[PDB]
Write a protein that binds this ligand. Structure first.
Ligand SMILES: CCCCCCCCCCCCCCCCCC(=O)OC[C@H](COP(=O)([O-])OCC(O)COP(=O)([O-])OC[C@@H](COC(=O)CCCCCCCCCCCCCCCCC)OC(=O)CCCCCCCCCCCCCCCCC)OC(=O)CCCCCCCCCCCCCCCCC
Ligand code: SF4
Ligand code: SF4
Ligand code: SF4
Ligand code: SF4
Ligand code: FES
Ligand SMILES: [K+]
Ligand SMILES: [Zn+2]
Lengths: 209, 60, 238, 115, 96, 95, 115, 129, 176, 263
């Protein structure tokens, strides 16, 4: 690189992924709403909520995809979107050493039928997406709590949920049992507003709205 | 017959507080994530963050 | 130590020498273990043919690292997708062919030796140069430059209070952490702080597969399979 | 906008149908739970308490909210009978360690400057 | 230096002083209240006033790399000996 | 090191190898803890000649994801060439 | 071809002693089920492209050892396994039928990160 | 168009009962909304573009030992970000919080000039440049 | 590149099986374990005699914090306020005021030892290198209150370990 | 109607004739970096940070005082525009004193923020910095004139907005000392607002001096009660008390200035 400071880019993978992005797009014009290949050679397949089985089964068993490695499933709670939750699958191909990202919008009540049949790895990887966020997964073997406390109330990763939560424990000599009380902190979280009032990088700027 | 590995007995905010700590402040979290592989976690974080910044570290 | 943009500091003078002395003597210590356990019947019978998995279930279960390589799956992040300088070094990935507890154990001890190979190569080919990027907007300026140059002081000030603002987007980066595939997926909102960070914990998938492991095995073998699954709960519990 | 997905129930009838046997199950479980968990509270207290949390949310209209919270309320009765929770996890529902919070306007005014 | 309060209660450089009752002082008895006998204000005041004959003087504070960020304090106000903000050393200049 | 020769044969014979060649602990071989002061290098873009930040803008050179198909005769391709079967180990293929 | 290799190096996946004709009869089967899906379909055109073409030399070249690099997809014993997976997909998307336009356009600007 | 045994619910959407914000933290929180006001000594305006979800500040008492800001308001240190306000209001309905808004203070367009600083009859002539 | 780790081809000659039968019948491999472990029995231990001898450390070590001061005696901290901003545990809490002289320093530098992480960001934060971690690590205690530090406690520790940390940053500031 | 058409970095936008380059920029959302121009305080044109190259231009135009006409594409992100920004910003920063850890503007300084976005990452200075003797124009506002960048925003504010002529820039060349020359006392009822207009720590509030920092101070919106005008103001609260009061943006009530008593 002539400029060693900035990270070199790989264009060869860029259109090759872009070619594969159109590829999967033409097979399913019913499901694939949006395909996007980012600057860092990462491809994203935006699908409809009821596409968890079809496209994943497509990516898992296709001759030209063979994406059978379920990397992770994550939600991105975005309050300003009418669909707050954004379930994100990550897929990995052993044969083509590439990565696949598919995202589905979902509301709180609207369920997502479980992808356990496609990948059995998602069995445990839904018990926390129901825990942290509260998105319910339909026709799933078990939705048990494995991160939150036994009988804990709420979905902590939701951004309407406080960092300190609501309940704090303490052993009580009156009852010989640790019990919960409303949280009161020794010191409150001194929040910092670090968003500079002067505009950042103009590339990703939103259009005049 | 069956075994249920009830996890959670060490569950922490981690990702929850990362939403409130800056990138530099969030770096020590990964050291405590896979606490036996100290430097390898930060490798993942630094590789990720510098990828978004489109900045590559010097060869040294 | 490992910070975005390189490393925080440079090594103390002579540190490469002492680690070189350790590297020379360490291979003996690996031989020490193999002598102790590898041929011992008691260790094998508590480990061989225990917790075996097929290649397809291991891959479908989301496993990574040794959990796949032990079952014969031909895959390794450093080789297939070489991050950092891992491309300019050769190492022999220890692929097993049984998938039971024993194969992973031999896979690990060979990975110990193959790790020692990396130390030797990077030691004989350690290049000179700076330790962080030459961009104060993401790398704090040198302490000497801090106390003499204004732009260093401003950039140091804004970096330690506001921090660098990361361009918006999403990225799931992947490295082969000795557990397995430790990946971090973060979404940047365009501010100076992360918006949401999800981490791919190799133990999470592995602990998820612990059910299929324990099928048809002794209770005194559940401890054995738990041991080889390289689970640390700080990692699996996030 | 109005048209939406029935996660389990078309109408509040089958939503109220769902709450019934789970209410039946929750009322059947009380004598055994207190027995093996080794508590001091009375069986009726569990019954009148199992009554309690059924009512503070007995005002919704969307059949998704009720039936999603049905599987939510589904999700402790098995968590109890398989002794997964601790004693501290169901006396938590019997909130008892705290002082009784103030109800009259004068009492809040006396305690502090917080509605 | 350090002063003494009516309750003894050796005052700190900040000026904290528990009152007569001040029930929080019960933590102090049977223990000792940690006081830094060296007070910042009166260990810089007696320091000699430097005499440098120039309008602009660098104020790195000794060991430029190891000191404090170097400032370029002005020395023209003959009423008040110009001092570095970081250092606190009072630089005066002889008769312009 | 301290250890007399007769002990050394006992350790060497029991373990089947010589151990005085390399030992678990340390000795005089370590670098002294008072190494001379270093002279760390300068940055590649530390030059006071043409060095405008308009050239290196890693954060600013980033581009939002490229639009390729949006909701609002063909060939068959793959996201990458299929992997290459790596050969066995040259130093020691069969352990 | 040659001597039947003892193991594939992947536990669980065994060695099929008659691989060439099994790969043949699989490839016809996916061609057969691909008859149902109408011509205008893109998925049909894609796999009608790589089936017969990959059915070509497996019909012509009988040496599975050379068949390894003919398909550049690893060992034949899992290529047929992958061929089975393609057959599973043909059965699966014979229900999915994704050739219709989108079920729904994305509600307003739910995309367009950042917010 | 989404024919998976369709149902229609005209009740205004709320999730307060299953989200689980406690009873004294749902009705006793006067949640207000505004566009964040720019700090007046910062000419940059890349802060007056979003909407927030701030709450009402509660009692903040100093810790007896070392003078903290010990506070029993769990919801105090949370602000959300909303692109427009109709999505912001929608969040209020689903969580059923107390409501009040504040319209954007858009800049009235100041007709600037440079020749006005040197006029012949108008007093807009500047006294210093 | 790669290599196999368990491909064993046990030769079926009358020779090797006799060795295999010898291995199982006479516990040869187990005897190796005895002879192996016996070898280290006759070797010296590497057990440091604490506290008569400590472990080996480095000049960059991070331990108990201690606010330092200039050779004149004035405190280094200048209400810089960067330290808590970069501190990822918010243990630092600092409030400044006007001072009588005008060198308006802080009244409070309470850092909670049960909150801090010994991050190392503290020294990198303030340009006047006011707060640093001393090499001490034996500052254990029995009551949680003592671990809660305050401006007097740090400054006292700075006056205590001043002889040590001054040389530590003397031999390490070139790296920094 | 008469709204002249003009392009900005591409996209075209109609605009009232006589509008300067800036005032067309924020119509699409462009905030060109500025130091000497305030939207409700005259036009200075001296900072030269607003300098943006225009299409076909052989010279970068001063965007503040340049009236735009037909079809003038604003090359905002163009290389030479950012080149002009880089040069001019390091010139302003040349003689600036290293006071950020001790300057109250730290964390909310326009000179600090823009150098992060539109600025270099290292220094090329190898000389001695200029030092300006401090002044004293009140116990309500501090004067550290070495931090001044001579944006002249203070003197204009006094001349028109405050209606008092007591501020100016004595000297010549680098000795551009802005103040009152003679010893004077800046008593106006709107005097406290020169703290907010100043982009640097040149003038800061003595009562607030060395008490808090911008990142830690929580902000709340309230009203002024010290006068019947009822000015909208933002209250700074941190650790559970109030430190400083800032005027809010309300063109009908207070614009962005408040009385000294309220501040
Ligand atoms: C079983 C075999 C017989 C008993 C052990 C004999 C023995 O150790 O002989 C010395 C000697 C020690 O060899 P080493 O262990 O290699 O020494 C390592 C360092 O040189 C050691 O260097 P060092 O400077 O540490 O040597 C000083 C050491 C020297 O110690 C000795 O020489 C051990 C004999 C007691 C003195 O004495 C001490 O450390 C003082 C503390 C003694 C603790 C209590 C000892 C109890 C001894 C038995 C009591 C009765 C039973 O033994 C041998 O060399 C071979 C074994 C014995 C051969 C002699 C015939 C029997
Ligand atoms: S200790 Fe350092 S960072 Fe903290 S206020 Fe003092 S100078 Fe600033
Ligand atoms: S002690 Fe550690 S955690 Fe606390 S502020 Fe210093 S570096 Fe951060
Ligand atoms: S004016 Fe800004 S850049 Fe200058 S010292 Fe003050 S805060 Fe730092
Ligand atoms: S003192 Fe402040 S307002 Fe006045 S000219 Fe200088 S920078 Fe501008
Ligand atoms: S805005 Fe044109 S020079 Fe300040
Ligand atoms: K100012
Ligand atoms: Zn100084």
């Amino acid at each position: 690189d002539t400029r060693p400071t900035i990270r070199p880019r790989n264009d060869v993978v860029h259109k090759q992924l872009s070619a594969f992005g159109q590829y999967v797009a033409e097979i399913l014009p019913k499901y694939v709403q949006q395909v996007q290949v980012s600057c860092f050679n990462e491809l994203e397949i935006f699908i409809h909520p009821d596409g968890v089985i079809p496209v994943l089964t497509f990516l898992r068993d296709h001759t030209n995809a063979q994406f059978k490695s379920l990397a992770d499933l994550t939600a991105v709670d975005v309050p300003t979107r009418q669909n707050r939750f954004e379930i994100v699958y990550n897929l990995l191909s052993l044969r083509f050493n590439s990565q696949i990202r598919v995202k589905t919008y979902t509301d709180e009540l609207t369920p997502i039928e479980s992808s356990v049949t496609v990948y059995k790895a998602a069995n445990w990887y839904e018990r926390e997406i129901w825990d942290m966020f509260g998105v319910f997964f339909a026709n799933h073997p078990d939705l048990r709590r494995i991160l939150t406390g036994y009988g804990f109330e709420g979905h902590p990763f939701r951004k309407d949920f406080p960092l300190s939560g609501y309940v704090e424990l303490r052993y009580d000599d009156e009852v010989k049992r640790v019990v919960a009380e409303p949280v009161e902190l020794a010191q409150e979280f001194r929040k910092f507003d670090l968003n500079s009032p002067w505009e950042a990088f103009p590339a990703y700027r939103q259009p005049p709205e | 017959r069956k075994c249920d590995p009830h996890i959670g007995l060490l569950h922490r905010g981690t990702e929850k507080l990362i939403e409130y700590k800056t990138y530099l402040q969030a770096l020590p979290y990964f050291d405590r994530l896979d606490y036996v592989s100290m430097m390898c976690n930060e490798q993942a974080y630094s590789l990720a963050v510098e990828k978004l910044l489109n900045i590559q570290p010097p060869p040294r | 130590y490992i910070r975005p943009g390189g490393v925080h500091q440079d090594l103390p003078l002579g540190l490469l020498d002492d680690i070189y002395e350790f590297s020379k003597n360490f291979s003996f210590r690996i031989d020490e273990l193999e002598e102790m356990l590898t041929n011992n019947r008691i260790w094998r019978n508590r480990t061989v043919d225990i917790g075996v998995v097929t290649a397809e279930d291991a891959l479908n279960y989301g496993f990574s690292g040794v959990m796949l390589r032990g079952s014969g799956i031909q895959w390794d992040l450093r080789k297939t997708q070489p991050y950092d300088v891992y491309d300019q070094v050769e190492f022999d990935v220890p692929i097993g062919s049984r998938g039971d507890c024993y194969d992973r154990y031999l896979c690990r001890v060979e990975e110990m030796r193959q790790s020692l190979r990396i130390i030797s190569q990077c030691l004989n080919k350690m290049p000179p140069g700076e330790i962080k990027v030459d961009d104060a907007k993401v790398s704090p300026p040198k302490r000497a430059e801090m106390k003499t140059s204004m732009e260093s002081l401003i950039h140091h000030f804004k970096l330690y209070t506001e921090g660098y603002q990361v361009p918006p987007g999403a990225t799931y980066t992947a490295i082969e952490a000795p557990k397995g595939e430790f990946g971090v997926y973060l979404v940047s909102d365009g501010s100076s702080r992360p918006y949401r960070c999800k981490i791919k914990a190799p133990g999470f998938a592995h602990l998820a597969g612990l059910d299929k492991m324990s099928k048809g095995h002794m209770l005194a073998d559940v401890v054995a399979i738990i041991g080889t699954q390289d689970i640390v709960f700080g990692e699996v519990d996030r | 906008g109005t048209s939406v997905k029935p996660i389990f129930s078309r109408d509040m009838n089958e939503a109220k149908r769902r709450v019934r046997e789970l209410y039946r199950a929750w009322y059947r479980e009380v004598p055994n739970t207190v027995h093996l968990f080794q508590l001091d509270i009375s069986v009726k207290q569990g019954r009148d308490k199992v009554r309690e949390m059924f009512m503070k949310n007995a005002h919704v209209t969307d059949p998704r909210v009720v039936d999603l919270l049905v599987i939510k309320g589904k999700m402790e009765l098995e968590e109890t009978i398989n002794v997964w929770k601790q004693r501290t996890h169901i006396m938590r529902f019997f909130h008892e360690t705290e002082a009784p919070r103030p109800t009259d306007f004068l009492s809040k005014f006396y305690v502090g400057h917080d509605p | 230096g350090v002063r003494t309060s009516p309750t003894g209660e050796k005052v700190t450089h900040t000026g904290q002083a528990y009152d007569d009752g001040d029930y929080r002082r019960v933590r102090f008895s049977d223990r000792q209240k940690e006081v830094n006998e060296n007070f910042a204000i009166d260990l810089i005041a007696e320091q000699p006033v430097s005499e440098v004959g120039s309008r602009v003087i660098s104020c790195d504070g000794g060991g430029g790399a190891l000191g404090h960020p170097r400032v370029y304090i002005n020395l023209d106000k003959e009423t008040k000996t110009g001092t570095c903000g970081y250092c606190g050393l009072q630089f005066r200049q002889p008769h312009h | 090191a301290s250890a007399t020769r007769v002990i050394q044969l006992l350790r060497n014979w029991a373990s089947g190898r010589d151990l005085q060649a390399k030992l678990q602990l340390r000795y005089q071989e370590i670098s002294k803890r008072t190494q001379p002061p270093p002279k760390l290098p300068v940055g590649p873009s530390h030059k006071l000649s043409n060095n405008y930040y308009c050239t290196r803008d890693g954060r600013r050179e980033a581009m939002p994801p490229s639009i390729v198909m949006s909701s609002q005769e063909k060939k068959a391709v793959t996201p990458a060439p299929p992997i290459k079967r790596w050969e066995l180990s040259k130093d020691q293929p069969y352990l | 071809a040659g001597l039947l290799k003892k193991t594939t190096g992947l536990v669980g996946l065994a060695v099929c002693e008659t691989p060439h004709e099994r790969l043949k009869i699989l490839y016809t089967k996916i061609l057969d089920v691909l008859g149902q899906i109408p011509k205008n379909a893109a998925y049909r055109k894609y796999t009608e492209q790589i089936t017969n073409e990959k059915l070509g030399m497996v019909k012509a070249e009988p040496d599975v050892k050379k068949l390894e690099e003919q398909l550049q997809g690893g060992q034949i014993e899992e290529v047929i396994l992958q061929a089975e997976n393609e057959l599973s997909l043909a059965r699966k998307m014979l229900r999915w039928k994704p050739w219709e336009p989108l079920v729904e356009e994305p509600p307003a600007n739910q995309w367009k990160w950042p917010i | 168009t989404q024919d998976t045994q369709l149902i229609a619910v005209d009740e205004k959407l709320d999730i307060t009962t299953l989200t689980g914000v406690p009873e004294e933290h749902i009705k006793t929180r006067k949640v207000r909304i505004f566009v964040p006001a720019r700090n007046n000594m910062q000419s940059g305006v890349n802060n007056t573009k979003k909407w927030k979800m701030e709450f009402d500040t509660r009692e903040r008492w100093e810790n007896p030992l070392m003078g903290w800001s010990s506070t029993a308001d769990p919801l105090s240190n949370l602000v959300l970000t909303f692109s427009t306000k109709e999505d912001a209001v929608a969040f209020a309905e689903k969580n059923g919080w107390s409501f009040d808004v504040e319209e954007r203070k858009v800049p009235k367009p100041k007709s600037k000039s440079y020749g006005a600083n040197f006029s012949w009859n108008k007093r807009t002539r500047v006294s210093t440049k | 590149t790669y290599k196999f780790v368990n491909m064993r081809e046990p030769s079926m000659d009358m020779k090797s099986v006799t060795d295999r039968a010898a291995q199982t019948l006479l516990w040869t491999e187990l005897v190796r374990g005895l002879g192996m472990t016996l070898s280290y029995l006759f070797r010296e231990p590497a057990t440091i005699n604490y506290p008569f001898e400590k472990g080996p450390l480095s000049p960059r070590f991070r331990g108990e914090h201690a606010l330092r001061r200039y050779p004149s005696g004035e405190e280094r901290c200048i209400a810089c306020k960067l330290c808590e901003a970069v501190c990822p545990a918010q243990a630092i809490t600092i409030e400044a005021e006007p001072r009588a002289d005008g060198s308006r320093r802080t009244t409070r530098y309470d850092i909670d030892m049960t909150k801090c992480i010994y991050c190392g960001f503290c020294q990198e934060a303030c340009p006047v290198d006011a707060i640093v971690e001393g090499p001490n690590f034996e500052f254990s205690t029995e009551t949680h209150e003592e671990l809660l530090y305050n401006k007097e406690k740090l400054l006292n520790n700075g006056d205590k370990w001043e002889a040590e940390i001054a040389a530590n940053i003397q031999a390490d500031y070139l790296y920094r | 109607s008469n709204l002249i058409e003009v392009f900005v970095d591409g996209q075209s936008v109609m605009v009232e004739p006589g509008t300067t380059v800036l005032q067309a920029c924020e119509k699409v959302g462009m905030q060109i970096p500025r130091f000497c121009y305030h939207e409700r305080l005259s036009v200075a044109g001296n900072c030269r940070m607003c300098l943006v190259e225009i299409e076909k231009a052989p010279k970068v135009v001063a965007a503040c005082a340049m009236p735009v006409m037909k079809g003038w594409n604003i090359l905002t992100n163009s290389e030479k525009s950012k080149k002009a920004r880089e040069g001019v910003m390091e010139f302003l920063l040349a003689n600036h004193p290293l006071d950020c850890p001790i300057c109250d503007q730290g964390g909310e300084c326009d000179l600090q923020d823009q150098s992060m976005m539109f600025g270099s990452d290292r220094s090329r200075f190898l000389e001695g910095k200029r030092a300006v003797e401090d002044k004293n124009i009140g116990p309500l506002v501090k004067t550290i004139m070495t931090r001044c960048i001579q944006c002249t925003r203070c003197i204009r504010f006094a001349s028109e907005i405050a209606g008092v002529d007591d501020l100016g820039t004595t000297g010549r060349g680098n000795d551009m000392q802005v103040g009152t020359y003679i010893e004077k006392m800046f008593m106006s009822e709107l005097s406290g607002n020169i703290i907010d207009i100043c982009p640097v720590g040149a003038l800061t509030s003595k009562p607030y001096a060395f008490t808090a920092r911008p990142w830690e101070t929580r902000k709340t919106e309230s009203i002024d009660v010290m006068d019947a005008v009822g000015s909208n103001i933002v209250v700074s609260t941190r650790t559970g008390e109030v430190m400083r009061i800032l005027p809010r943006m309300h063109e009908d009530i207070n614009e962005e200035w408040i009385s000294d008593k309220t501040r």
